[PDB]
Amino acid sequence: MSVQAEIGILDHVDGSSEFVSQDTKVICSVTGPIEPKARQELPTQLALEIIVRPAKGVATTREKVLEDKLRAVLTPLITRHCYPRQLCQITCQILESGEDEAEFSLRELSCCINAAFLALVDAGIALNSMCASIPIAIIKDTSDIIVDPTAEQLKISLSVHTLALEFVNGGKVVKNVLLLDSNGDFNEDQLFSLLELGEQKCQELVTNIRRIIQDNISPRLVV
Amino acid sequence: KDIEISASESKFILEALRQNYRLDGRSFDQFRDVEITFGKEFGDVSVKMGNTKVHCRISCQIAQPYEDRPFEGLFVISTEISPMAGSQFENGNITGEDEVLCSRIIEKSVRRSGALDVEGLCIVAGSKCWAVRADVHFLDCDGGFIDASCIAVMAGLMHFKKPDITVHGEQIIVHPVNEREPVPLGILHIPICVTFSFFNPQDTEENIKGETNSEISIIDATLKEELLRDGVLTVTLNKNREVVQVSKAGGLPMDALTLMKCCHEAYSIIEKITDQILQLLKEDSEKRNKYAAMLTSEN
Amino acid sequence: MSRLEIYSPEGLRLDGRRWNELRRFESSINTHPHAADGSSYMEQGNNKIITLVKGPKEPRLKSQMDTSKALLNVSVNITKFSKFERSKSSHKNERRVLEIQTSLVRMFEKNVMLNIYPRTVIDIEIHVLEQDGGIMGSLINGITLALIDAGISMFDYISGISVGLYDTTPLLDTNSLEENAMSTVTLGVVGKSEKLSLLLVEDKIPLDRLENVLAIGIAGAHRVRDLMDEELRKHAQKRVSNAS
Amino acid sequence: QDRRRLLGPAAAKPMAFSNTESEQELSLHTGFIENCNGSALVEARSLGHQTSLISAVYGPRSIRGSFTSQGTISIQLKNGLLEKYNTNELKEVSSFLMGIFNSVVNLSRYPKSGIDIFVYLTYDKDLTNSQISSLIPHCITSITLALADAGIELVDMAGAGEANGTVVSFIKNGEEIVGFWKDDGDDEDLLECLDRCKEQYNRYRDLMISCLMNQ
Amino acid sequence: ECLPAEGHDWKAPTKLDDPEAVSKDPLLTKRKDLRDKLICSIDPPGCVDINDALHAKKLPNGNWEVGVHIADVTHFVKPGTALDAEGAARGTSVYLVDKRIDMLPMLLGTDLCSLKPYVDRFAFSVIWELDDSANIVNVNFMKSVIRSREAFSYEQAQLRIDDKTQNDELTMGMRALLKLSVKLKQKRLEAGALNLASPEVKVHMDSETSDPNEVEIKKLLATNSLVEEFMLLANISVARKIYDAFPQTAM
RNA sequence: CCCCGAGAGGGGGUUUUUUUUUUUUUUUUUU
Structure with a gap:
């Protein structure tokens, strides 16, 4: 869980970030609230334009799924009723997969969730709470649950998991499970053991994120 | 989505040019300091010019050559813009005026010019070959996208290394990097782009029928200077003292001798830039070798 | 390596010019x-363009x-x-064509007084019926003539x-054969001026040869301007004679 | 290949196989698509060719483009699962169908509205161990059923028939013609085709009315 | 016609900064001046077309300064000309006992480019700085102008070294070159250099009779190994330099 | 700033969806 992030790296965007876990590096940018296109307009709430760009080649249907899952996480996080008939552009440029993209998209999704959240924080957009996402995997010979697995570990995995939780009260109370994307062969006992260990490492991540956010933003503010 | 520019800002930036002043404090003939950072993987390069940030990634995969060219490999360059560089850019807008121009400048500078040895991308004639792909990612826009991309693509191609392949009959044997070292690409020449921006300090009448020329030309304009220019010129050269391509697609009519002056001024810049790229590649190679020695020693 | 006499020692080209x-x-x-x-x-050579x-x-x-x-x-x-x-496929959405269209627009935006026609649209449709080298230069001349005819x-x-630049030599008004055998430079010249x-x-063109090539093109473009101007006054004069 | 679909590997090649008057009966169903306003299922089986096509009517809905005293109608044919036709040929039939229902649909009752009619050529089996001409009368039957099921006003039950590459659609008890189509065929066979098609038109119209009522 | 208009009375400019000379040759400012060096050429008796010229000095830091000087043919033959065309066509000059079919005109190959003694001649020079064990510390390539002290023969050069007669700065340099060559040859042998052989016979011709009567054998003197070792050294350093500059079109 | 009444009335100054990428002719050195 030795992640590293930077905040406010882009000039022509309201907010930006660069999240790095292992070899997975994703840069994200957020502009909003701004004027929306007519087809995007929502009478009462904020409209989200979510874009995911791959590390190699052009955006395909694969990234279209990454956009969809990332939408399921960011939508309830943002206090959308504060910005009626308005738009918020959220762009993720995956710079380095950190995994075999022909087989997995686990680490890229988690890194996009964490980066998007950080970019939303930087942009100063109304959020109902905080959030953290981690990738998890299981190995058949080992029987182990490995949090933040490497690319080599994924190759020999039986199941891959993306867990993103919603935290409140100083990152101590799990408000809800924003996203759990479990793929592969697994049983009910493995699922809850995954959720128990997953919640712990997620809570540790929020604490680390809270540290990063305060370290970067506080110099900008005044005492 | 438009960028609103007040009359005051338009008059100020133009008047500053009339007083030999540009906002960033540079010189009319001064090119921005280019910073080149290589990632862990080969083909991963990050180019930075002031606030302008671009990232290029070189990749390749086994593919079959076209019927017309059985001895040549495949090579494509992608430069899709995104709202990350600014909300002025539409996501996936690959038919806009500026987009198509930029796409065509890079293509004529690298692809068409034959900067990459596509003949050396062939494994077995008319059957299997390498398909090199250059993906440019525009992170942050402060002008000079064309110059930043051309450096990003070239630095990437010269830094990239493809895995060794042995072929017997139909079968293809893709050797992993650890078992045997990867092989660099073949570069015939190193094309570098330098973009000039033109400003008419007077009116159109004095540009068309005016006796003495007074049009201002600056090298490597920022976003603000780029939005207020009347004409653009992109000239590509290499250390061999040859013009790879020149593109002044319309805009402010400019004196021929002035355009020639720009080409000679750009040549001094591309020389410094090319040598700079080579040096950063050597040090990167020395860095990777020194770590390889420190990894084998302790091992 | 060309087996054809692109530029014979007698100073003659493949077409005779x-x-x-x-x-x-x-x-x-x-x-x-x-x-x-x-x-x-x-009609510039075998080039045939409707504008x-x-x-x-x-x-x-x-x-x-x-x-505005x-x-x-x-x-x-x-x-x-x-x-x-x-050609089997169409060229309508070809990047090469989009650049050409964009280029032409960027050329006449600084020549056509668009400011005196606010809240209007000027659509320029071009049909290339036949192509034989220097199609870009012919496209420029076609638009200039058609725009004038429209009273714009x-x-x-x-x-x-x-x-073109074959070896040292510079060749004015090159055709398809010459363009396939050497590098060419396309020049748009405003009026009688030296401004491009x-x-x-x-x-690829050597940096030393580029200035001389420009000099040839500008001189040749001035002749194209004269021919365009000549034919235009001829058409004008007849109309004036018959109308008045 | 395509960035919007999964078409698989490019080196893959499709599987190619090797070698080692008659009465017509049809089945009719309407209103089984909750997604739209009107829908119809038309299945026909005869000799060495069976056809199962589905029609769907969407309208009257809003029109962005222009003001209209009367309604606007669009017809689009889509290729089905296995049998395929040229896009040009599907467009041509669409145009031919538009002309027919612009003579039947009471457009005056739907100002500034759009009636978009879709016909899916779902399953067209060719069992013979321009074929599009034999599908045309079944399309008209489906569109007529779908429009009536949608509640769109019709001057009369438009039906059709096919005989030797000649297709002609009738209204008003076969007194008048709302569309005439002829490919291939023979010479001076107009009178014979009109009679044979009117017989099919009458049979189709009876089954259509029987379907719109009893079902 | 592609030959210099001067003819046989062509001469390298006395001053390399002279206005007239710089006006005609703007590249003359890049030309180094090694006419103070002690250059000599070791070639067969009847050799008029001299390609290579050697010299040696002892630097104050204990190391040796070795310079191999090659005829500056490029300055006279330019790409595109008919002279260059015929030069490429022939590829090389053939050597017979009878005659000698030259690749380039006599005026150019026997005189203007030929590194003759007692005259100022243009040359492409390669200068090394190496220790006593013949190990290269550094190497520089430069177009220069030289003046050959003496055009020795292989037998004449060997005798001068052998005698011990002359203490002259030139002969002292000639001995030094021989010392380096032995070290250089030895390193190559240790490295894995081959030693093939095919000493063909030389058709002796009587002065008295045009018809040939005697067949002898050419003997390899130590001066032959002297020239060979430094020619190889020159070719190697140049090969490394040109390939570093042009990795894709290096001859 | 603009149009209609002879005198502080009236009328106008111009907003939002549709459809993918190629591209021309017997080693080595001096001779």
Whole structure:
């Protein structure tokens, strides 16, 4: 869980970030609230334009799924009723997969969730709470649950998991499970053991994120 | 989505040019300091010019050559813009005026010019070959996208290394990097782009029928200077003292001798830039070798 | 390596021309009165170009409307039968064509007085019937003529020309064979001036030869301007004679 | 290949196989698509060719483009699962169908509205161990059923028939013609085709009315 | 016609900064001056077309300064000309006992480019700085102008070293070159250099009779190994330099 | 700033969806 992030790296965007876990590096940018296109307009709430760009080649249907899952996480996080008939552009440029993209998209999704959240924080957009996402995997010979697995570990995995939780009260109370994307062969006992260990490492991540956010933003503010 | 520019800002930036002043404090003939950072993987390069940030990634995969060219490999360059560089850019807008121009400048500078040895991308004639792909990612826009991309693509191609392949009959044997070292690409020449921006300090009448020329030309304009220019010129050269391509697609009519002056001024810049790229590649190679020695020693 | 005499020791080219002579340049004004406000049929060598100027008129969509200037649009239709070998696919969305259209717009935006036609649109449709080298220069001449026929105000003529560089030698007004055998430079020259609206180099050219090539092109473009101006006054004079 | 679909590997090649008057009966169903306003299922089986096509009517809905005293109608044919036709040929039939229902649909009752009619050529089996001409009468039957199921006003039950590459659609008890189509065929066979098609038109119209009522 | 208009009375400019000389040759400022060096050429008796010229000095830091000087043919033959065309066509000059079919005109190959003694001649020079064990510390390539002290023969050069007669700065340098060559040859042998052989016979011709009567054998003197070792050294350093500059079109 | 009444009335100054990428002719050195 030795992640590293930077905040406010882009000039022509309201907010930006660069999240790095292992070899997975994703840069994200957020502009909003701004004027929306007519087809995007929502009478009462904020409209989200979510874009995911791959590390190699052009955006395909694969990234279209990454956009969809990332939408399921960011939508309830943002206090959308504060910005009626308005738009918020959220762009993720995956710079380095950190995994075999022909087989997995686990680490890229988690890194996009964490980066998007950080970019939303930087942009100063109304959020109902905080959030953290981690990738998890299981190995058949080992029987182990490995949090933040490497690319080599994924190759020999039986199941891959993306867990993103919603935290409140100083990152101590799990408000809800924003996203759990479990793929592969697994049983009910493995699922809850995954959720128990997953919640712990997620809570540790929020604490680390809270540290990063305060370290970067506080110099900008005044005492 | 438009960028609103007040009359005051338009008059100020133009008047500053009339007083030999540009906002960033540079010189009319001064090119921005280019910073080149290589990632862990080969083909991963990050180019930075002031606030302008671009990232290029070189990749390749086994593919079959076209019927017309059985001895040549495949090579494509992608430069899709995104709202990350600014909300002025539409996501996936690959038919806009500026987009198509930029796409065509890079293509004529690298692809068409034959900067990459596509003949050396062939494994077995008319059957299997390498398909090199250059993906440019525009992170942050402060002008000079064309110059930043051309450096990003070239630095990437010269830094990239493809895995060794042995072929017997139909079968293809893709050797992993650890078992045997990867092989660099073949570069015939190193094309570098330098973009000039033109400003008419007077009116159109004095540009068309005016006796003495007074049009201002600056090298490597920022976003603000780029939005207020009347004409653009992109000239590509290499250390061999040859013009790879020149593109002044319309805009402010400019004196021929002035355009020639720009080409000679750009040549001094591309020389410094090319040598700079080579040096950063050597040090990167020395860095990777020194770590390889420190990894084998302790091992 | 060319086995053909691109430039013989006798100073003669494959078609018979010398280094310095333009190709039959025949212009034609008011060719499509019932189809456009302005029209021109260009024959520069084997090149055959129909140019239609439609406007200034009401935009079809109020979303695309400028209250300070007219909207200038150019669409180049390179037909599938323009070249000896018929192209299977269309060129309508070809990047090469989009750049050409964009280039032409960027040229005449600084020549056509769009500011005096606010809340209007000028649509320029081009059909290339036959192609044989220097198609870009011919496209420029076709638009300039058609725009004038439409009575649309502009500051000056824009003449287009191409110049090849075979070895040391510079060849004015090159054809398809010469372009395939050497690098060429396409030049757009404003009026009689030395100012270039368009400088286009797509192949390798030594830095030392470029200035001389430009000098040849500008001189040749001035002759194209004279031919365009001549044919235009001729068409004008007859109309004046018959109308008055 | 395509960035919007999964078409698989490019080196893959499709599987190619090797070698080692008659009465017509049809089945009719309407209103089984909750997604739209009107829908119809038309299945026909005869000799060495069976056809199962589905029609769907969407309208009257809003029109962005222009003001209209009367309604606007669009017809689009889509290729089905296995049998395929040229896009040009499907467009041509669409145009032919538009002309027919612009003579039947009471457009005056739907100002500034759009009636978009879709016909899916779902399953067209060719069992013979321009074929599009034999599908045309079944399309008209489906569109007529779907429009009536949608509640769109019709001047009369438009039906058709096919005989030797000649297709002709009738209204008003076969007194008048709302569309005439002829490919291939023979010479001076107009009178014979009109009679044979009117017989099919009458049979189709009876089954259609029987379907719109009893079902 | 591609030959210099001067003819046989062509001469390298006395001053390399002279206005007239710089006006005609703007590249003359890049030309180094090594006419103070002690250059000599070791070639067969009847050799008029001299390609290579050697010299040696002892630097104050203990190391040796070795310079191999090659005829500056490029300055006279330019790409595109008919002279260059015929030069490429022939590829090389053939050597017979009878005659000698030259690749380039006599005026150019026997005189203007030929590194003759007692005259100022243009040359492409390669200068090394190496220790006593013949190990290269550094190497520089430069177009220069030289003046050959003496055009020795292989037998004449060997005798001068052998005698011990002359203490002259030139002969002292000639001995030094021989010392380096032995070290250089030895390193190559240790490295894995081959030692093939095919000493063909030389058709002796009587002065008295045009018809040939005697067949002898050419003997390899130590001066032959002297020249060979430094020619190889020159070719190697140049090969490394040109390939570093032009990795894709290096001859 | 603009149009209609002879005197502080009236009328106008112009907003939003549709459809993918190629591209021309017997080693080595001096001779």
